[PDB]
Amino acid sequence: PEQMAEEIRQALEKILKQLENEIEIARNAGDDEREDRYRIAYLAALEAYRLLAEGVRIPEAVQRAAAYLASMGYPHYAELFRAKGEELVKRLLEGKVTGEEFARQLVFYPAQA
C-alpha cells in the first residue's frame, strides 16, 4: 500500500514529463483544444502526486484531487476523474492493475474528448 503509493508517484513523475512534451507539441501546432486538455491532465497528475507524497491514502487522494480539479474550474474532467478513480481503486486493490496502469488510466481516461 505504501509500496503501491511509491509506484504510482513514480509513474506520475514520468507522466508529467510526457504531458509537458504533449503540451509543447500541441502548442507548436496551434492545437489549443488539445493543449488545454493536456494542461488539465497535468494539473491532475501534479495534485495527485503531491497528495501521495503527503502520505494521503490512495482512495482519499483521488477524491481530494477531484475537488482540486473542480475548484480550478474543470468540473467535467473532475467528475470523470473521480468516477474513473473510484473504479481504478477497486481494480487496484483486487490486483487487476499495476501502479503504473493506475496512474496512466487515472490521468488519461478523463483527458479524452
Side-chain angles (χ1 to χ4, degrees):
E2 284 298 298
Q3 179 59 41
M4 283 315 315
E6 176 58 23
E7 287 178 19
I8 294 171
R9 285 196 301 269
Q10 287 167 356
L12 286 162
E13 268 191 86
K14 80 214 186 322
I15 285 168
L16 283 157
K17 220 165 283 290
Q18 292 172 334
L19 287 166
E20 276 192 55
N21 200 41
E22 299 294 345
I23 287 168
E24 285 172 20
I25 296 175
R27 190 181 64 220
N28 290 343
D31 194 350
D32 291 343
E33 185 268 354
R34 194 163 300 279
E35 184 180 342
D36 294 345
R37 287 165 54 203
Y38 275 123
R39 282 175 173 265
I40 296 171
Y42 185 93
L43 298 179
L46 181 60
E47 180 65 6
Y49 173 90
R50 73 137 259 132
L51 285 166
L52 294 177
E54 273 296 83
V56 181
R57 65 202 308 274
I58 293 162
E60 187 181 355
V62 171
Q63 299 297 326
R64 285 172 70 183
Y68 162 98
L69 291 161
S71 75
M72 286 295 287
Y74 318 112
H76 293 301
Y77 181 99
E79 288 311 310
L80 287 174
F81 182 91
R82 191 199 300 277
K84 182 60 174 187
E86 290 171 9
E87 198 166 335
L88 285 173
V89 164
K90 279 149 44 178
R91 280 175 58 76
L92 181 68
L93 98 191
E94 73 192 350
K96 285 166 166 177
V97 296
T98 61
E100 185 177 1
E101 288 179 282
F102 179 95
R104 293 201 171 280
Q105 290 177 33
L106 179 69
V107 174
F108 283 98
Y109 179 92
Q112 299 177 311

